[PDB]
Amino acid sequence: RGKRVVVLSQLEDTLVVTGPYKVNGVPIRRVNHRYVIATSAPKIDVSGVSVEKFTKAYFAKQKRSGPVKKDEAFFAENAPKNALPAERIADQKAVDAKLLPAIKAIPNMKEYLAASFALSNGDRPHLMKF
């Protein structure tokens, strides 16, 4: 929450989005369009990054078919370090590599995604125009 993210493509229902992982460390994710604030920030190129590999099945979680879960070794498993194959870091690093020159060229883009959005005193969302 509060992280600023770049939209890669529109899925069937969600949006495949990811902040440049070298900027804000937000992996590729499906995000429902009802939990997104579209800003008037300048558009970042996306034609240079290939998105067909980003499918609902690709993001899908392995089915369990059972209520079983909840174990210490289970939580020691998964984790950002492992249980995700090296191709996942590979394609994202390709994404950041394709995305970084675009954000670098136009000023303030890197710091903007580094910062996290939040409301302050005297902020009224219905009157502010993102």
């Binding site: 929450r1 509060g2 369009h33 009802r34 939990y35 997104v36 604030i37 579209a38 996290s116 959005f117 939040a118 409301l119 302050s120 902020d123 009224r124 969302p125 219905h126 009157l127 993102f130």
Partner: protein
Amino acid sequence: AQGHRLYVKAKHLSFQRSKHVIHPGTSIVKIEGCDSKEEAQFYLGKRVCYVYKSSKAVRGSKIRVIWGTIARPHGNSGAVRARFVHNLPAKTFGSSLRVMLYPSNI
């Protein structure tokens, strides 16, 4: 400390009522910063939550939440009507509510 509060501050005014008959199913919520029914249209359908604290540690946490949704404006002053999953207690009149920014349509 200015890096959070993605919600809007609100207050539980009272229940939807006549002079003598109260209808606890829907509550009247004053979203602060909203001063007309036109501005209340922005907050229609947003998710409002009532956050309170309890002695028992349910789920290892002492913080409980009652969810709800803004339905329609109430009057000309910018107050709205909200329906919660559990009808809010009458002791929460004048208490603080949290209006989320989702489901977003901006």
